[PDB]
Design a binder for this molecule. Structure first.
Ligand SMILES: NCCN1CCOCC1
Length: 330
């Protein structure tokens, strides 16, 4: 079997991407944030505290004739960005672009932090990292991808995020028309439960490519590109007036600037991120200072190849016996 769904930016800055998911019987369509950096499928629901719901579509397990309460199971998750959510668990039928999983754990939220409440367009998350990170206790649950893998034509999912435009998440197949040139595959470590790979280096604009090992994760659930301070400083040093601001919490640059591109290595291949992808608009409404799309991972502990980097590429998440990551230009 296969599945194909359109993913769309939630706003004019591509701050996140939402993809419709059908849950239950009859179908209840929620727009979820497909997250390759986490492993819980969780949703805003009829059980979420009234004050913590602001415009999101909710999942009502009681109106789903296939929803089964997973007895004594609870989930609680804290993300790198400080946001959190928690609640109880149902098993239900879940479909993504025509690919169906029966008995998928749907984690129903009782509590969400304010960061989730303020994003009216994000109805929950669909975790696509390795099932070892799943927070369901006392019995861990598998991801949608893990549940479908046996049924899939090929054990893969692809991420094709758009810049200021719609994109696609495909399951079970590789769309050979969605990229140019070839897909370069690279090794993956699943020890931390993430799609963790090693980039072979980088370049700023038309500068000479620097061969250096950058370990990081392919994370669709993180908006920006988080890299070592040496790397990020070399990038922002090319932007006139750019500086690291402690008040704003990152590198800012004049909104009138035309940014240089950023290239990252995948083996001997190169993915070029156009400069416009790195502009995240005014730091505050009406400001002529803009927020940068390339930030330092020094406070994080891990380098993150988020949407800023992934949207410049056609990305294959190969869930073969030994998982790997594929990247092609598009
Ligand atoms: N609510 C703050 C975080 N979110 C994250 C996703 O993009 C929009 C802003």
């Amino acid at each position: 079997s296969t599945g194909s769904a359109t993913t769309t930016p939630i706003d004019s800055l591509d701050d996140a991407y939402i993809t419709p998911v059908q849950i239950g019987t009859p179908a209840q369509t929620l727009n979820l944030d497909f997250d390759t950096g986490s492993s819980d499928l969780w949703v805003f629901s009829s059980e979420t505290t009234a004050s913590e719901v602001d415009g999101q579509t909710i999942y009502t397990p009681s109106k789903s004739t296939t929803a089964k309460l997973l007895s004594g199971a609870t989930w609680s998750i804290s993300y790198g960005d400080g946001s959190s959510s928690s609640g109880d668990v149902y098993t239900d039928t879940v479909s993504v672009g025509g690919l169906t999983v029966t008995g998928q754990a749907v984690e129903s939220a009782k509590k969400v932090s304010s960061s989730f409440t303020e994003d009216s367009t994000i109805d929950g998350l669909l975790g696509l990292a390795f099932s070892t990170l799943n927070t369901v206790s006392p019995t861990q649950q598998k991801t949608f991808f893990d549940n479908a893998k046996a049924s899939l034509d090929s054990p893969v999912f692809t991420a094709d995020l758009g810049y200021h435009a719609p994109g696609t998440y495909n399951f079970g197949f590789i769309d050979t028309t969605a990229y140019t040139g070839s897909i370069t595959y690279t090794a993956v470590s699943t020890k931390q439960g993430f799609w963790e790979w090693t980039s072979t280096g980088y370049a700023v604009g038309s500068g000479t490519f620097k061969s250096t090992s950058i370990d990081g994760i392919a994370d669709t659930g993180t908006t920006l590109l988080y890299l070592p301070a040496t790397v990020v400083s070399a990038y922002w040093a090319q932007v006139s007036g750019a500086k690291s601001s402690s008040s704003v919490g990152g590198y800012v640059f004049p909104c009138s600037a035309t940014l240089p591109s950023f290239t990252f290595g995948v083996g001997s291949a190169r993915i070029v991120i156009p400069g416009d992808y790195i502009d995240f608009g005014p730091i505050s409404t009406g400001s002529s200072s803009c927020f940068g799309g390339i930030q330092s991972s020094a406070g994080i502990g891990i380098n993150i190849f988020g949407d800023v980097a992934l949207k410049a590429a056609f990305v294959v998440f190969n869930g073969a016996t030994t998982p790997t990551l594929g990247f092609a230009s598009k």
